[PDB]
Short mmCIF file of C-alpha atoms and ligand atoms in Angstrom, two decimals:
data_model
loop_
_atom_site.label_atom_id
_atom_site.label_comp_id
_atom_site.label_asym_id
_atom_site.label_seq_id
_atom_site.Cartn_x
_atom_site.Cartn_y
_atom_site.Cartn_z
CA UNK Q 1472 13.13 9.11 -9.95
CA UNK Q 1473 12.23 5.30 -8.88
CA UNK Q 1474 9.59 3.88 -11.20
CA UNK Q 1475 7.60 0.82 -9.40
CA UNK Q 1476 5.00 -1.15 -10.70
CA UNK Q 1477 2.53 -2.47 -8.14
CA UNK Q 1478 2.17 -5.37 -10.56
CA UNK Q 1479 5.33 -5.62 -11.81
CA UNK Q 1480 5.91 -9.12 -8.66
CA UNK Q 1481 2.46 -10.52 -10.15
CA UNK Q 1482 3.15 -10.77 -13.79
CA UNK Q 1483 0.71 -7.42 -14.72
CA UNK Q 1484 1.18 -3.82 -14.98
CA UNK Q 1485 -0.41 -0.32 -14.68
CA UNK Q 1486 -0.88 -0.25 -18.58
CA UNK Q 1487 -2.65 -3.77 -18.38
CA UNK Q 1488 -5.16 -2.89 -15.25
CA UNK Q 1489 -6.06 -0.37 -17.30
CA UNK Q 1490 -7.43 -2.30 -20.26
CA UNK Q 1491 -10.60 -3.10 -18.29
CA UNK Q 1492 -12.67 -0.06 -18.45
CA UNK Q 1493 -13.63 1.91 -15.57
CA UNK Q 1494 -17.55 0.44 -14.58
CA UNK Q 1495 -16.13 -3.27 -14.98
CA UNK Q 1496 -14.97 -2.78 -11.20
CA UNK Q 1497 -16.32 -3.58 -8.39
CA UNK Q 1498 -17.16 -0.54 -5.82
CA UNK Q 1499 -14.04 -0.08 -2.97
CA UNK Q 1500 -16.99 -0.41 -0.57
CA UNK Q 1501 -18.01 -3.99 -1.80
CA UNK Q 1502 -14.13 -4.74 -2.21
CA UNK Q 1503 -13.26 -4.26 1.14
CA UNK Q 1504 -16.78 -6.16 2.54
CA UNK Q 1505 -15.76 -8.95 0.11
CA UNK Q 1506 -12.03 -9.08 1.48
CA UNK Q 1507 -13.21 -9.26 4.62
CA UNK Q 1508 -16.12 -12.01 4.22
CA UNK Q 1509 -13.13 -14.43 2.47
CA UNK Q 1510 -10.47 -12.98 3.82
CA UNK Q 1511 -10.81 -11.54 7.17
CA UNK Q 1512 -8.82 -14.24 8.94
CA UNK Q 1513 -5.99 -14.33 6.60
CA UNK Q 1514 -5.05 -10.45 6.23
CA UNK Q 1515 -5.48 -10.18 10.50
CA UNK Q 1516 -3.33 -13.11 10.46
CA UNK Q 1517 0.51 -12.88 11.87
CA UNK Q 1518 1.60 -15.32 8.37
CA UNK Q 1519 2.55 -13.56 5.57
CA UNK Q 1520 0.67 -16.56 3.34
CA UNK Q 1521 1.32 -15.34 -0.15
CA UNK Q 1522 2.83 -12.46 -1.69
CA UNK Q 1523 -0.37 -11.34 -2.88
CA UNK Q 1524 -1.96 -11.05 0.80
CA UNK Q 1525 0.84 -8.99 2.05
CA UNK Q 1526 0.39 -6.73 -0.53
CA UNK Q 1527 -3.76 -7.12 -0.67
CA UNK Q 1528 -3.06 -5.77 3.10
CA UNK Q 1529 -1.16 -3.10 2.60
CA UNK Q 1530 -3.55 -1.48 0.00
CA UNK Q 1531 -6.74 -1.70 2.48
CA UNK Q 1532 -4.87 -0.04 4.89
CA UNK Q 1533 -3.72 2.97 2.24
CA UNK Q 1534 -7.46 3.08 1.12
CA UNK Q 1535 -7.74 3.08 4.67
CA UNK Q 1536 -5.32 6.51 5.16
CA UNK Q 1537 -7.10 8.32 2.09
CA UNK Q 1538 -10.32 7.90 3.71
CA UNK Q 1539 -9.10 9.06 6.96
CA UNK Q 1540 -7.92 12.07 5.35
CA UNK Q 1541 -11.23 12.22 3.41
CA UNK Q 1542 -13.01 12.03 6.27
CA UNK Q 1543 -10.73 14.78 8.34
CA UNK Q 1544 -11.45 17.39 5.34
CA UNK Q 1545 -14.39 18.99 6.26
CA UNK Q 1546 -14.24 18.02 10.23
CA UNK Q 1547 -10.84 20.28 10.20
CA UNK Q 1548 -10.64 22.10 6.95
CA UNK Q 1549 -13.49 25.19 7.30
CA UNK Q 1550 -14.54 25.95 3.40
CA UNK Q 1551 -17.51 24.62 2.04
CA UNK Q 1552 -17.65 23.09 -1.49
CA UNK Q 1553 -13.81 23.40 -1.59
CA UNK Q 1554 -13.88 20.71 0.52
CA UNK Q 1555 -16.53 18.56 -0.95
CA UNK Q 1556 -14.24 18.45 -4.21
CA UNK Q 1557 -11.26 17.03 -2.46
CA UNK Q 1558 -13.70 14.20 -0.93
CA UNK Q 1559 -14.92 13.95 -5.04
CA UNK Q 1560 -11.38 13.68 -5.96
CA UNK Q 1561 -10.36 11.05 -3.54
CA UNK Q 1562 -13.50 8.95 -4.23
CA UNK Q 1563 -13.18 8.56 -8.09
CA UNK Q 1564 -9.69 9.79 -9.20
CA UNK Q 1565 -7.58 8.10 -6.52
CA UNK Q 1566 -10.84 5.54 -5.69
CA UNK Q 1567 -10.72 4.10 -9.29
CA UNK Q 1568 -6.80 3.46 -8.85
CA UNK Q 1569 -7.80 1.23 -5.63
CA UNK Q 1570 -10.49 -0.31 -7.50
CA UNK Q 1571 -8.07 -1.76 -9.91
CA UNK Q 1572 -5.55 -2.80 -7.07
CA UNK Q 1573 -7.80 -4.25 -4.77
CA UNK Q 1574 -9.76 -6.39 -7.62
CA UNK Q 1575 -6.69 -7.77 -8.83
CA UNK Q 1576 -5.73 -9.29 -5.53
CA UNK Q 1577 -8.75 -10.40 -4.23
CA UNK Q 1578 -9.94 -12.06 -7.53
CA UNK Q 1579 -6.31 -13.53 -8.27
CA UNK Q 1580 -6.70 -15.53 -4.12
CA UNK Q 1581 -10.03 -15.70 -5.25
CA UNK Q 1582 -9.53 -17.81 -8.47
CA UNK Q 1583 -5.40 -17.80 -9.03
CA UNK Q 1584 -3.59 -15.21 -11.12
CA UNK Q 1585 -3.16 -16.93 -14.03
CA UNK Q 1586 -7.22 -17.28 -14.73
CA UNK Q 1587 -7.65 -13.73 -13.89
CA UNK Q 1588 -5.10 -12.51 -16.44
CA UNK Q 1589 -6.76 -14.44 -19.07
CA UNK Q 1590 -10.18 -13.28 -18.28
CA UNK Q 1591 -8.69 -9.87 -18.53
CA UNK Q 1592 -7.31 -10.08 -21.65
CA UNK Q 1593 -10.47 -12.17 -22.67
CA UNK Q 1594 -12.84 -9.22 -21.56
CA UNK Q 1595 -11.36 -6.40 -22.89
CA UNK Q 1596 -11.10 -7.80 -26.27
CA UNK Q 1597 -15.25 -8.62 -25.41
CA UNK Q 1598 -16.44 -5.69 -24.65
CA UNK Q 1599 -14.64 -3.45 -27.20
CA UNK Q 1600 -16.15 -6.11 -30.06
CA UNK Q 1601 -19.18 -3.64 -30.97
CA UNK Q 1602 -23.04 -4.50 -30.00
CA UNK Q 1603 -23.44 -5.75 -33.37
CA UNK Q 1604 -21.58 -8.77 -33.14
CA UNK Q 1605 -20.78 -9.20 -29.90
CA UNK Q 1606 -21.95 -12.23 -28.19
CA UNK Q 1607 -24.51 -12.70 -25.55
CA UNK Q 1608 -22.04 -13.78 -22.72
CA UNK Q 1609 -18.59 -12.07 -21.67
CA UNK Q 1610 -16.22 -14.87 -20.50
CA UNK Q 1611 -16.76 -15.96 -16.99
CA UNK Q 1612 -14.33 -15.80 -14.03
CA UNK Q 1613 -14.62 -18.96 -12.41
CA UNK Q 1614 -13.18 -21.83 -9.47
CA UNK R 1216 -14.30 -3.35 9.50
CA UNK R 1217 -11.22 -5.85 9.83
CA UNK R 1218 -8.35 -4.42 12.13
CA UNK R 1219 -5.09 -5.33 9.82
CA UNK R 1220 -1.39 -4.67 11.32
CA UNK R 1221 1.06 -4.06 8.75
CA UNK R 1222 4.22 -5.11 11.28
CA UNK R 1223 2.03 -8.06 12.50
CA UNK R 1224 3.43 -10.26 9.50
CA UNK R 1225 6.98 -8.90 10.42
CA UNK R 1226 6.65 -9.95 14.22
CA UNK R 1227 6.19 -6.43 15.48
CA UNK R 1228 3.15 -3.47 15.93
CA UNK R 1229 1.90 -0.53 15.49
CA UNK R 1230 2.17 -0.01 19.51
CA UNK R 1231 5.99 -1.18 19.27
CA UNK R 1232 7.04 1.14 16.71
CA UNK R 1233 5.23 4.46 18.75
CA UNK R 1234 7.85 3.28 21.55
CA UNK R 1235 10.40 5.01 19.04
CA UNK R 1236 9.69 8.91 19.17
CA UNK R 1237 9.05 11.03 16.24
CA UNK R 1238 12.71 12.50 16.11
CA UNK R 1239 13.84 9.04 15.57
CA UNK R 1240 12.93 8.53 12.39
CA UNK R 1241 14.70 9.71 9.25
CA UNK R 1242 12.27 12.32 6.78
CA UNK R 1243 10.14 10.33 4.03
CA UNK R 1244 12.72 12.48 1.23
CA UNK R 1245 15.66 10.97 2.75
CA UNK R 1246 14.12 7.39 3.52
CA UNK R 1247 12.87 7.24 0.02
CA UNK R 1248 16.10 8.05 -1.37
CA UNK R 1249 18.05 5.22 0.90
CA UNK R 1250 15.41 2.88 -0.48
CA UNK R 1251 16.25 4.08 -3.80
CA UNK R 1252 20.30 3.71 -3.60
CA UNK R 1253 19.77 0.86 -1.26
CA UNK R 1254 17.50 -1.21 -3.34
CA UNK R 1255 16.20 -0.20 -6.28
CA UNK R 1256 16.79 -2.67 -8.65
CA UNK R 1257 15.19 -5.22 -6.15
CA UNK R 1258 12.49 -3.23 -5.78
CA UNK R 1259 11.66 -2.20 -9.31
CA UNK R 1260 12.60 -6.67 -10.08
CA UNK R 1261 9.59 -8.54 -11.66
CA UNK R 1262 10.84 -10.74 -8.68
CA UNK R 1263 9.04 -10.73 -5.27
CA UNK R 1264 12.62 -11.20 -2.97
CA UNK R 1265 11.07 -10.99 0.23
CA UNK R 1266 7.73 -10.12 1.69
CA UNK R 1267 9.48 -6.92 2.99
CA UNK R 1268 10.40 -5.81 -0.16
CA UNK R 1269 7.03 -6.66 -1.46
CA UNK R 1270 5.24 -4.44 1.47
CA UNK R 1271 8.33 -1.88 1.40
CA UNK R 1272 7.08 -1.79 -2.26
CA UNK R 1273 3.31 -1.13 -1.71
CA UNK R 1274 4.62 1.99 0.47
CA UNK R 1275 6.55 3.83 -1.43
CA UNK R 1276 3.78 3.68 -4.33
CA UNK R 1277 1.15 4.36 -1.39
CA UNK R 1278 3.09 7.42 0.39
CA UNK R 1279 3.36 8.17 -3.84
CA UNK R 1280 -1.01 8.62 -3.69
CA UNK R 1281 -0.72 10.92 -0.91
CA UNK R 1282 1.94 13.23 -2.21
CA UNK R 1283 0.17 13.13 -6.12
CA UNK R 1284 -3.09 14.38 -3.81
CA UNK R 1285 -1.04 16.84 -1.70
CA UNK R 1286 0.22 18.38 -5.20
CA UNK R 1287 -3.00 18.07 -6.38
CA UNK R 1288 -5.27 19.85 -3.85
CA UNK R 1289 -2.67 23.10 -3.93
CA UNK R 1290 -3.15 23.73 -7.63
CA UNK R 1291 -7.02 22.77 -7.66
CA UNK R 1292 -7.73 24.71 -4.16
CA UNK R 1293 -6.37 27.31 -1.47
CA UNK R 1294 -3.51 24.38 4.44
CA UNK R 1295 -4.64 20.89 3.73
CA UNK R 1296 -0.40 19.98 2.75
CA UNK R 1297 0.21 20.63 6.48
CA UNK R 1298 -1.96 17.64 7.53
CA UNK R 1299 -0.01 15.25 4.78
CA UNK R 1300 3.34 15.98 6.07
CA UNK R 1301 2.90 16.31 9.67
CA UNK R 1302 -0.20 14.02 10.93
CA UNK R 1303 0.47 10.98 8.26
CA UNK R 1304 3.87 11.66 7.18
CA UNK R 1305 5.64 9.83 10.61
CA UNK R 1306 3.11 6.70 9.66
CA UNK R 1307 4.90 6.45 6.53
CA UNK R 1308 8.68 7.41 8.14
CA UNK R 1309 7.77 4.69 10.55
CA UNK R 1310 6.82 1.90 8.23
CA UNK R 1311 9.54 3.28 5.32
CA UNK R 1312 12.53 2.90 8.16
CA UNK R 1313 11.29 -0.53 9.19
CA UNK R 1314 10.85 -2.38 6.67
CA UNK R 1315 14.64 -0.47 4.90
CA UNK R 1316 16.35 -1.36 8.31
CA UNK R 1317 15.08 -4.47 8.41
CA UNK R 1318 16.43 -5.37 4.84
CA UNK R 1319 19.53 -3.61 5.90
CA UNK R 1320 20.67 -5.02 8.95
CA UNK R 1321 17.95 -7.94 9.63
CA UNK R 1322 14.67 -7.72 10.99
CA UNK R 1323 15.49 -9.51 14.56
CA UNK R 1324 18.45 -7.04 14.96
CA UNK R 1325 16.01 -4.02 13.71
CA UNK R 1326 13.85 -5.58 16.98
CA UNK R 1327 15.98 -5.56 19.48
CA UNK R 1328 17.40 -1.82 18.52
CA UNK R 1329 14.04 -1.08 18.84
CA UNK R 1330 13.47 -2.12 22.67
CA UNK R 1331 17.23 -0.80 23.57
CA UNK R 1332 16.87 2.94 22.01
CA UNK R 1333 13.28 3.05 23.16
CA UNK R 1334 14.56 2.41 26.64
CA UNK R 1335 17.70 4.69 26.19
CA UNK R 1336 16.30 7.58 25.19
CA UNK R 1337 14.02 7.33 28.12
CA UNK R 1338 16.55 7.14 30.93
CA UNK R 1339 16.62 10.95 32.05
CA UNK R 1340 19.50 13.39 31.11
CA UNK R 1341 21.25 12.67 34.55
CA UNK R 1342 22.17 9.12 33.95
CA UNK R 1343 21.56 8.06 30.25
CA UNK R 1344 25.12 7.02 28.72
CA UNK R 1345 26.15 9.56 26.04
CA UNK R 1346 26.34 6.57 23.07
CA UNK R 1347 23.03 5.54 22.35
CA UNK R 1348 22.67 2.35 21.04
CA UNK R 1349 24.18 0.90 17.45
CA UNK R 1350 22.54 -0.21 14.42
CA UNK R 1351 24.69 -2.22 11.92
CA UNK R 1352 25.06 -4.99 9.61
C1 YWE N 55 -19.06 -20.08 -27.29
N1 YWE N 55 -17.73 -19.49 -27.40
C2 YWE N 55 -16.52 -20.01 -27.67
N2 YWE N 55 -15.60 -19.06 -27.65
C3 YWE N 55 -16.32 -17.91 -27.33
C4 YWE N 55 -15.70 -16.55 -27.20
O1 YWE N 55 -16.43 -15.72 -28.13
C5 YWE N 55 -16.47 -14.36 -28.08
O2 YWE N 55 -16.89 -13.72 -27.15
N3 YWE N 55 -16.03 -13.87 -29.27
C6 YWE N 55 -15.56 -12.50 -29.42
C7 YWE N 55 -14.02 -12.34 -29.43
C8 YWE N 55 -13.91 -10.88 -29.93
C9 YWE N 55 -14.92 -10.90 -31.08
C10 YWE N 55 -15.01 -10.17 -32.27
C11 YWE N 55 -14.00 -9.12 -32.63
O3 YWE N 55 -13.65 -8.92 -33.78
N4 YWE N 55 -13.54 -8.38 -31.58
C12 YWE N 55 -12.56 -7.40 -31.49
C13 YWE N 55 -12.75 -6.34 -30.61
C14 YWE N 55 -11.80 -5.36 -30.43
C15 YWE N 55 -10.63 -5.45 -31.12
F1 YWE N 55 -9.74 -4.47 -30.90
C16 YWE N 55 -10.44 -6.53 -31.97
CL1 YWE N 55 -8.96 -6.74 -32.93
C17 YWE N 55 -11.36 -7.51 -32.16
C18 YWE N 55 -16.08 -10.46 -33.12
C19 YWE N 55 -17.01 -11.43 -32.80
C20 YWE N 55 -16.90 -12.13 -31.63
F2 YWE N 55 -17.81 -13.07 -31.33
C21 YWE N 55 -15.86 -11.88 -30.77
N5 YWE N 55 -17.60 -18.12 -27.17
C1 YWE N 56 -18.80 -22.70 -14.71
N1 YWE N 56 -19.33 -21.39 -14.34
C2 YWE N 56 -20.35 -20.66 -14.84
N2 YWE N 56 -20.47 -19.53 -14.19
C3 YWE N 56 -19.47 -19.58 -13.24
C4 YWE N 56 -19.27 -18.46 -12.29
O1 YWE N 56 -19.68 -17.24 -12.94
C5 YWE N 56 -19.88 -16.09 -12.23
O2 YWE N 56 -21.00 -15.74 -11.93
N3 YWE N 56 -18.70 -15.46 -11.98
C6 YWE N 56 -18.63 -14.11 -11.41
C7 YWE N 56 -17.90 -14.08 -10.04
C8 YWE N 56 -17.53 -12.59 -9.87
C9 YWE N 56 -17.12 -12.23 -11.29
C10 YWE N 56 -16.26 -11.24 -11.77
C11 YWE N 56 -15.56 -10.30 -10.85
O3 YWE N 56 -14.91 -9.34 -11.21
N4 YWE N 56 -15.68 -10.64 -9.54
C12 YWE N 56 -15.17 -10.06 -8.36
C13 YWE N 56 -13.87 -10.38 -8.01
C14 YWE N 56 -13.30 -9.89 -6.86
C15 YWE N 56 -14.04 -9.09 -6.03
F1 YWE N 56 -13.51 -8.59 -4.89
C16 YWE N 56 -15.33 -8.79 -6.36
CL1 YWE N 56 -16.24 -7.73 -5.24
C17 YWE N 56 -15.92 -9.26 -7.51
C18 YWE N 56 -16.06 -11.17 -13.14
C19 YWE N 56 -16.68 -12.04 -14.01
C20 YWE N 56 -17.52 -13.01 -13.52
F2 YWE N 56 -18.10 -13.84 -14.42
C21 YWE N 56 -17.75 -13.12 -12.17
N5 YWE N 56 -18.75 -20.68 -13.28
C1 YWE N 57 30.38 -0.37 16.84
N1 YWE N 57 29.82 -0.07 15.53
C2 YWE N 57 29.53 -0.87 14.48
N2 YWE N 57 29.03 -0.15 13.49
C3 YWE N 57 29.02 1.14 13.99
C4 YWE N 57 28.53 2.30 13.19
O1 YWE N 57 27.14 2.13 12.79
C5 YWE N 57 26.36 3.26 12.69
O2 YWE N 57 26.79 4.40 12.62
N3 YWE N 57 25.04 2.93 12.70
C6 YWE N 57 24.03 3.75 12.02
C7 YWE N 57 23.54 3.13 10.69
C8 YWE N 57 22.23 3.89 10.46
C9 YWE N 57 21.64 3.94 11.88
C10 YWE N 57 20.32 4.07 12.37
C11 YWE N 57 19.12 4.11 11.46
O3 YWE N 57 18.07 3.59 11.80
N4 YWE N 57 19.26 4.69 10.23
C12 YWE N 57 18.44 4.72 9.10
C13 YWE N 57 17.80 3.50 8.81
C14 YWE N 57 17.02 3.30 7.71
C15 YWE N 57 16.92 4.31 6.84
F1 YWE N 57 16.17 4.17 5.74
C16 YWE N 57 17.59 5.47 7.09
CL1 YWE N 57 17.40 6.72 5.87
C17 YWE N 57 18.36 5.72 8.18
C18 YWE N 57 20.15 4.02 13.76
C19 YWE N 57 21.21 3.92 14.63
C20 YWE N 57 22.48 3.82 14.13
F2 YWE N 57 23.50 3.71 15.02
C21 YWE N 57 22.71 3.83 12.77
N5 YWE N 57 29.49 1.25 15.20
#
């Protein structure tokens, strides 16, 4: 019965991740490729750096053991479209949950928590503001 | 791809913690609940405390994914739940138990228990002393 908030450390939480709608982020694909091309030499590294790259390495590498299990239904488990819906629910149930993580800590290295919290805030209440009078441009993230 | 180690931070591998065998390591139910009577106030702190406990932290919640997916799959299919448990549960009981021992008793203690048991255990029947090596504070 131990309740942990990934955020919690960071100053966020599950409820506020949540307040940016589903298609605001980025594909766990382009995460990871975007990790890596800023990144790389930093989460391979034997420093621990910040807080947030300890824990930015720690969820590639559980993406990481979700698609290894994605990838060893099928290639060990025999039925057919029973196995293509546990490979669905890993990529968009559990795959939107890693979205959110992975976002957070790449964009708050990226351009420092306290901006990205902000622009979250500052984005949510943008794109719920109806067509009708919403603005042109959402907020930027920027630096 | 990147090739990440989650000991390399923590001065240690994935290689150095295989030198323990399976049967070393407490199960994930009873490592979770040490972590829980051990530490949970640190670990559920808006505090970081240490980069273990922020790691130590990201596994629990992770090994938390896999379980929510191994409930999952029985009531949405019919098994898969013996992969969970027996292929990727030791990953977890390994990195759980380190990074709990090393808060424990001290990660450069937790490193040379490592080497000593690894060595011990190996040492045939014949000759290996009876008392393995200690762990403690
Ligand atoms: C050039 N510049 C300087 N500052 C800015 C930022 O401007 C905006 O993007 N404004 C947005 C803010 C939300 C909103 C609403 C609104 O009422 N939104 C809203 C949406 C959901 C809610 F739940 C609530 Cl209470 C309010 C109506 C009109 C708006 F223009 C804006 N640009
Ligand atoms: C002064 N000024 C004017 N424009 C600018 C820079 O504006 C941009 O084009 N910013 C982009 C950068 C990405 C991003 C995100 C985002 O979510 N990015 C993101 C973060 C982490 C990731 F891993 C990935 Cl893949 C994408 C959200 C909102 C954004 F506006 C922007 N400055
Ligand atoms: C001379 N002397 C001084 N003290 C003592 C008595 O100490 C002990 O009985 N030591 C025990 C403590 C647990 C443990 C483990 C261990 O790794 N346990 C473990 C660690 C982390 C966990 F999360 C869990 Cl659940 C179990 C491995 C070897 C051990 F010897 C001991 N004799």
């Amino acid at each position: 019965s131990m309740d942990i908030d990934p955020y919690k450390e960071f100053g966020a939480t599950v409820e506020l991740l949540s307040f940016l709608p589903s298609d605001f982020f980025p594909s766990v694909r382009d995460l990871l490729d975007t990790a890596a091309a800023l990144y790389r030499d930093a989460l391979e590294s034997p420093e621990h750096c910040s807080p947030h790259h300890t824990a930015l390495r720690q969820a590639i590498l559980c993406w990481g053991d979700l698609m290894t299990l994605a990838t060893w239904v099928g290639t060990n488990l025999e039925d057919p479209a029973s196995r293509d819906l546990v490979v669905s629910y890993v990529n968009t149930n559990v795959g939107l949950k890693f979205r959110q993580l992975l976002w957070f800590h790449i964009s708050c290295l990226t351009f420092g928590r306290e901006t990205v919290l902000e622009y979250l805030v500052s984005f949510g209440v943008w794109i719920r503001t109806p067509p009708a009078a919403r603005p042109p441009n959402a907020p930027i993230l920027s630096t």
